[PDB]
Amino acid sequence: VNMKLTGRIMDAAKEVDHTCRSSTGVPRDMLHRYAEGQTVDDDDFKCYLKCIMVEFNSLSDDGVFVLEEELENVPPEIKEEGHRVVHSCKHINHDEACETAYQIHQCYKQSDPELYSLVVRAFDATIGD
Structure with a gap:
């Protein structure tokens, strides 16, 4: 793809x-290695x-997920696919x-x-080591 992820997070x-x-x-x-798929x-x-x-x-300091903000955080180039992912994961809440x-x-x-691999790799390329 020639898709260039823009949006507030990438910016x-x-x-x-x-x-x-x-x-x-x-x-x-840790980071570019996480991007490159490594656990x-x-x-x-x-x-x-x-x-x-x-x-x-999209999260409070004490760990409260905020759906409306996360949907806004999805880059415009992948709004459909990214919204689908966010909606599928909106009930996750761990002990901490x-x-x-x-x-x-x-x-x-x-x-x-x-899609997730795509996003993390684009994030990592904008940051730079």
Whole structure:
């Protein structure tokens, strides 16, 4: 595809990665490696996912999922397919704010692997190591 993911998350990927990586202590081998499909399940990586969601209004600091904000977070180029994924994963809630985020994300991955791989790879390419 020649689809270039735009939208508020892609626009601010470097900004939000800067604040969230500094907060959580997650380095790159984790992030671009997670993009490249490698399992990254370190406690800090989970809190990095959580931090991104908090910065884009789809999760409260204490781990409350906000559907309307997440639907807005779907890049415009994949609105249909991405909304489908979000709606399929909107009832996930784990014992702890970070685990909740990480497994909302593993639910996205389950729901549509190729779409999810597409999004994480585009995010990672905008940030840069």
